[PDB]
Amino acid sequence: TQLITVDEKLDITTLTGVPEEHIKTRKARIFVPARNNMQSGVNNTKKWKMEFDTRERWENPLMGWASTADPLSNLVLTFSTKEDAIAFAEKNGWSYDVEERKVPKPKSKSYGANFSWNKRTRVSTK
Amino acid sequence: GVRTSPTGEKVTHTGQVYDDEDYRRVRFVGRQKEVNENFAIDLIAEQPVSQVGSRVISCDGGGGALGHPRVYINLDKETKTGTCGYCGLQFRQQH
C-alpha cells in the first residue's frame, strides 16, 4: 500500500528453475513466421513467434526415430508486439535475435494496363 | 521371391538389408526375422488388364463402401493403360 517501488530491471531467470546450461548456451529467435508460400493467405502472419534454435537429433537405434536431449526443442510462444517479445526475453534472461517484420509491398496493376497499345505490358495469351 | 544377400539372410520388399559390418545382424541371433513372403509388385502380373469398350471409366474396388473411393480415369494414352492410384489395376479401351 504505497510501498517501496524502485524503477529497475528484472531477473526472473534465477527463479524459473531451468538450468544454466540451457540459460546461457541456448539462443532465442523472434520472428513473424513467413507465409507458407504454396498457399497465399496471411492469417498466419500478425504474430511474433519466439522459437529456440535447433540442436542434435540422432537416430534411435532400435526403431529409426529421432530422439533428442533438448527439452526446449518444442517451445513456441506466439506474441503480438515486438516490444513485449523483447521485454519477455530479456526478463527471462536468455539471448535473442530480432528479425524485422516484412509486409508485401503494395503494387500498381490494372487490367487496362494488361491491354496496352504501345506499352510493353501486354497480356499475350487471352 | 526373396534375395539372399551375401550377408546371408532374408530380404524384404524394401531395400533395407544390412552390411557385413553391423551389430544388428548379431542382435538377430536366436530369433528369426519374420517377414511377409507374399510380396507386392508380383501381385500386379496376376491381375489381368481388363478391356472396357468405353472411354472415361470407373474404379471402385470391389464393394460399395468397402475399399477406396470412386475415381474416374481416362484412356487417352493410346498405348498406356489407365492406372488407379488407389487400386493398382489396369484398364483398356476397345473401339
Added chain:
Amino acid sequence: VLRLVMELSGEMVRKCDPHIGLLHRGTEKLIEYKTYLQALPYFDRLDYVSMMCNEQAYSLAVEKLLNIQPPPRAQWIRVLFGEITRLLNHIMAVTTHALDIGAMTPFFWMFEEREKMFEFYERVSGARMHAAYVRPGGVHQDLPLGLMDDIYEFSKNFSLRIDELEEMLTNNRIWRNRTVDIGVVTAEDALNYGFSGVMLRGSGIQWDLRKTQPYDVYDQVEFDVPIGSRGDCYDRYLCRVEEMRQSIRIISQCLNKMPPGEIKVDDAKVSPPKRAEMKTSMESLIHHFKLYTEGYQVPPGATYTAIEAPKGEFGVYLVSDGSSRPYRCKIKAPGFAHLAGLDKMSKGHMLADVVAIIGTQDIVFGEVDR
C-alpha cells in the same frame, strides 16, 4: 493412492495432512499441446469410475461454446448413458465403501451386475471402460439393433438385485453402529468448503444442477432427488442408494420416450460425415480429411460449464484462442473439493472412522489430480 500423515492423540486424532499429488499426470498441460477431438480421452480418464458423464461434460462445453445443439435422439441417448454411468459410479462407490469397511460379499454381487454393464459398453462401442464415443456434436456411431431390449432386461433384474442389497445391509445393526455418529457437516461448512452434489444432498440444502439448470432433456422426466436430514454418513449412504433407484426410474422413462431422429449433427463442418458420402462426395471427403488433420476452428472466448457427475459438480473451464487447439482447459473436480475439508470433517474421531470418511465421499484419486 494417497499419502496420509496424521497426528493423533491416542486411538483418536488431532490433525491430518493429506499428501495428494501421487497421481499427478500433467493432464492440463498435455491438453494445451493438443487439439479438441484428439484430447477428448484425457477428459475421459481423469475420472475413471464415472466414465461417460466426463465425456458428456466436455461435449457440452464444446457444443455450448460452438453454439450448436445436437439432434434430439443424440440428447436422449446421451441421457441414457448418463444414467448408466450414474448407476455405475454409485454402485461401485457403495461397494468399495463396503469392501474397505469390511463386508466381503456385496462387492462381488454388485460387480457381477456391473459386468453386465461393461458388456453393454462393449456392444455399444467396443471398449470395456474408456469408450470415447461421445464426440462433441453429439454421439458417434449409434447403437446396434438389439440393445434397448437388453437394457430393459437389466432394468428388471437389477431392480430385483438392488432390493436384495438393501435386504442384506441397511438395518445391518453393526454397520449402522459402524457409520452413524461420524461425519457431521454444517450448512455453513457445506458452503464455505465448496462441496458438490451428494454432500449437499446429504447435509441440508436441496440442490441439483440437473434440476435447477437442466443442461439437457432431464427436465422432461419424472424423478425426485433424495435429500438428507441429519447431514450424516449413514444418511448419505441412503442418499446414494436412492439416487441409484431414481436412476432406474429415469432409464424406464427414457426407454419409453425415445425419438428416432439421427445420430450426429448435420452441420458437417463439425462432425465428420459417414462412409457412403465419404467414399463418394467431394465436400464430405474434404471435410473428413481436414477435420481429422487440423481439428475444427473454435471461436475465441472462455466458457465454463458443469454437470452432475455422480461425485458432484464436474466442472470444466475452457479458454479458447481462435484456434483448433484449446489455450487452457481446467477441471473443477468434486474429488478435490471433497478432499479439501478433511480436518474439519474429522477433528473428533479415530482412524478407522477416517477410512470410513474417505469411503463416504466417493474417491477415485485420478480426478482429485487435475
Added chain:
Amino acid sequence: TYKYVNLREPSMDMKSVTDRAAQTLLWTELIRGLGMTLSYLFREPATINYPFEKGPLSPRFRGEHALRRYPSGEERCIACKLCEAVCPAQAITIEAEPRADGSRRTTRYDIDMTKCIYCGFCQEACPVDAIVEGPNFEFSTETHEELLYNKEKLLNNGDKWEAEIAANIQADYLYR
C-alpha cells in the same frame, strides 16, 4: 421434486418398542442376512471356465491393430498419414516413399504398443480401411523389444487372418 429419507421417530407403542428390544437382545436381522447369503449359496454361481470358454463380446471390439489388403491385391495403405495425424499418443510412425511402379506407398509403418491407448480414431480416420483394430487381444509379451510393431509384423498379422476382420466389417460397415 424431492423425496428425502430418515424422517420418522421410534414409535412409543409397546409392541414396536418391544420389537426393537427383541431385535436388540435376540440377534435377528443378522440371521436374516445369513438367510439371504445362504440363498446365494444355493444358487449356481456364474463363472466362465476361462481357457476353454471365452467371455462374450461385440462385433466392434478394438484389439490387435491389423492391416488389410485388396482382393488378390496389394497393400491397402496409401500412406496418407491421417492415422499419424490423429494418433493421440503419436504411436504411429509413417515414413512414406514411392516404389518403382508409381503408386505412392510407404517405407516405415510403426505402431508402438506402449503409447497406443486403443482409441479407434485411426480406424475411423482411415479413408480406405487400411488399419483395422483386430479382434483378438492376446499379446502377453515377455520382452519389451517385442511390443513394437513393424509394418511386416502388421502384414503377417493381417495375413494370419482377414476372415474375422472381413466378417466383422461386412456385418457392421453400416453403422459407421
Added chain:
Amino acid sequence: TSVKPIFSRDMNEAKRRVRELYRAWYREVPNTVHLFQLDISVKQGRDKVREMFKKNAHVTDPRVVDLLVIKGKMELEETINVWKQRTHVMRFFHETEAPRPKDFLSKFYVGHDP
C-alpha cells in the same frame, strides 16, 4: 510505477532473513543426515549447502530475494519433517555423474555441444 513488495525495504532485511535462514539450515543438517541414515560427511553436506547459497549472491533485486527466502524456508520445512524421502535428499547431491566439464576440446570430441 507501483510495485508492492513482499517483505523488503532495503536489502538489510534481506540480509537479516537470509542469514537467519542459513542458521536454520546449519542446525538443520546434522539432524537430517542422522535421521535418514545417510552416508555423507557433515563437512561435505554443509559445504554443498553454502555453495548453493553462494551460487545466487549475484541478485540484488529485493523481491527476488524475498521469493528465494520463501522457497528455502519451504524446503527446510519439508526436510525437517520426514515428508521428503532419501531420494530427494540425495537428489540435491550429485554423486552419479554428470561428468561434463567446460573444456573446449572435450566438448569438441563429444560433438555438437557448443
Added chain:
Amino acid sequence: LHHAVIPHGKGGRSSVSGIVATVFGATGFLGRYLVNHLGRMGSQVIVPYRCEPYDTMHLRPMGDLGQIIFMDWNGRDKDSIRRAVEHSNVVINLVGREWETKNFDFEDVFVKIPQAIAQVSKEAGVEKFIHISHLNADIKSSSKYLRNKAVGEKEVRETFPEATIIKPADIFGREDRFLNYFANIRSLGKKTVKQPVYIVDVTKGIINAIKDPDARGKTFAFVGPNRYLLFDLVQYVFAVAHRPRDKVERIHTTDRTLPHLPGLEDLGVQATPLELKAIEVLRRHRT
C-alpha cells in the same frame, strides 16, 4: 567403420555411444557394475549367461529399451561362443568360481576358457579385449587358483598379444567377499599388510580405458590408497560395525606393489578411500 558405432550427441539412456561390448560373465559382481556404467554411458552390451534367466532378469533393466541383449554360452563349444562374438566391437573376459566344482577346477576355466574365446576372437577380429586377472597370481605356490591364473595370464599375453591384461587388487564394496567373511566370523588373527581398493573406481577405470583408445597392450594394476595391516583392518571393521580355508589363505598370501606396470594415474580417476565407502557400506549391524 560403419555408422551406428560412432558416438551420437550427449550421453545416457540410448544415446548411441561408441562401444558394442560382448561380456563373458557379468552375472557376478564386477561385470554387473561394469554393465551398469556402460548403461550410463549408453553402450550396447551383448551378454550370454548360462544359469536361469531370473538372475539376468534382476539385472535386466539396467539398459534402456532393448539396448542390452541376452544369449547363451557354454564352457565347451566354440560354435556358441563364436555366434556370441560374431559381431562385437570389444570383448571382456571376467570369470571364475573361487572353489572347485564337480565339473571344473581352478584349472581349465582360467586355462581352457581364454583359449577358445581368444581363438574365435582372433579368428573373429575383435579389438580392445580386456582380460581381468587377480593381482599377484604367480607360478609360485599356495594356490591352484593363483597358478592357474598365471597360466591364463601367459596364454592371453602370448596369443592375442595386444590385450589389456588388467588386474585390480582385491576389491571391497556392497557385495564384497572378504568383508563379508569379516562379518561371517567365528576366530583367528595373523599379520599381512594389504591395500583395499573400492569397486567403483575399478569399474570406472575399466570403462574409461576401454572407451579411450591408444592405451593398449599394457597390463595395468589397481592400487589401494591405505596399504596397512590386515589385523588392524579387522579391528577397523569390528569398530565400525559395532560388535566385538582357501579364502583365508589367499588373503594371507600376497599383497604388494609391482613397480613395472602402470596404474591409476594413466587414467585420471579419483581414488575413493577405504574409510568413506566402508562407513557407507557397513550397515546391517545392531540397530
Added chain:
Amino acid sequence: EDNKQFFGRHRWVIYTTEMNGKNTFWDVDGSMVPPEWHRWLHCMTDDP
C-alpha cells in the same frame, strides 16, 4: 455347443494334443483356434 447352459457357457472348445507340436495335451494356450472359430466361440454369431 449346448443350449441349456447360460450365456457364457454355450460354446466351449476342447483342445487336442500337439496341433503345432508342443505337447499341448497339458498347458493349453489361448489362440489355438482358427479365426472363423474365433468368431463363433466369442459369441459374435448364432451359427457355426
Added chain:
Amino acid sequence: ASATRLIQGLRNWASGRDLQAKLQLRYQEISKRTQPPPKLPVGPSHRLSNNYYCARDGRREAMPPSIVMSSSEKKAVSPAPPIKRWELSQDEPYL
C-alpha cells in the same frame, strides 16, 4: 436354476423373493445375433433446393461480448428470479 424343488423351496424360504422367476442367468432374451442390416436415416439436411449454409452457420453466430464498464435509478435487482421451493413428490415420499 436347473435344480430340484426341495432346494428351490429352501432358496425361497431363505429369501421370499421368487428367485426361480428372475435369477440373473440369461437364457431366452439374449439378443438373437446376426440381425438384419440396418438402413440409417438422414436427418433434416441433404434436403435439396433450400439448404443455404448461410443460415445455419452456428460458428459465425458468435458475437463478441458486450462491455458495460471501463477502466433515482430503479435498480438493485437480482440476476434471476428467486428460486421457488419444490414439492415433496407424491410417489411415496417420507413421510
Added chain:
Amino acid sequence: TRPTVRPRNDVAHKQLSAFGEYVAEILPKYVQQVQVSCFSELEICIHPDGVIPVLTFLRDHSNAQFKSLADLTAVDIPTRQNRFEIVYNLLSLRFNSRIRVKTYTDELTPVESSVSVYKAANWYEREIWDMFGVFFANHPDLRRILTDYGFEGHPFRKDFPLSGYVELRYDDEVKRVVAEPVELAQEFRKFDLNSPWEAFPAYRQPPE
C-alpha cells in the same frame, strides 16, 4: 438457423446486463469491466486490490448471495506485463447463476489470499502457488501439493516445456533412484496446424 443451432434467451441476457451494471456502479473502486457473452454468463474484470472487499460483498448483501466457490487458475498469458489471471468462479445457491471474477496479476506481486472468506480456497491457492508461483501473503500454509517435493520449475507456465527437465531412473551404482537430464526416446512431434484464412470475420483485430 433454427434446427441444430442452439437458440438462446435474451431475457437472461438483459437480466445479467442490468445486474452487472448494478454491481459495477455500486463498487466503482475496482471495476474496469463487466462483460456479458452471448449465452449469458457474467464476467467481472477487477484490479488486484479489491479481492477481499469485492468477495466480501459478493458472498452476502441479499441481492447476490453466491456462496459457492470454484476454480481459481491464472491463465498464463504472455504479451502482457501482468501475465497471470486469477479466475474465481462463483455460483449462487439462491439465484442459479455463474459469475467469473477475473482479477489480473503480475509475476511477483501477491493478490490478497481469498481464503479469509472462502474456506474452499485453501488448496486452490496452494495449487496455484505450486503450479505457478503466484504468492499469497496472509495465508496459513503454502506447500508444494500436486508436485514432487524435490522438483521445481512451476510447470504449468508456458516457460516450462512439455517434458520435464529431470527424468528418474533406478541404478544399482548407488543402489537407489536418481534424476538425470531428460533423454527422450522420441521427439514429441509438432504439427503446424494453425491454418490461415480467417475462420471468424467478427473477431478480427485491427492490424498495424
Added chain:
Amino acid sequence: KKTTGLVGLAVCETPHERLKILYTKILDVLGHIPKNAAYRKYTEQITNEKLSIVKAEPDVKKLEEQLQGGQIEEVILQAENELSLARKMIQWKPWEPLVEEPPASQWKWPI
C-alpha cells in the same frame, strides 16, 4: 417450529422481533455510512422493502412464501452477514473513485 430441513441450524422461537432488531441495526449502521453514494440508496430501499414485508405480517408460513429466503432462519443468518459487510464497509470505501487503470491492452481477449 419443529426440526427444520437444514442441519447445523436449530429452529428459533421468536423470529419476528429478532428479525426486526436485526434490520433496525442495519438501518443504524447504514446511518453511519456517508450520504451521496447510491449504495445507501440500494441498501436502504431493499431493507425498507423487507421490513415492510415483515411488519405487515405476523404469520409464519405465508411469511415464508412471501419473504424470499426459504425457509426462515436463513434470512436471519443472511441478515447477520449483511451486518458483517456493513461493519466491514464502514471502512475500505467502496464508493470512492477508482485507483489507476490497467495498461488497457489487457482486457481484450483474442490476442
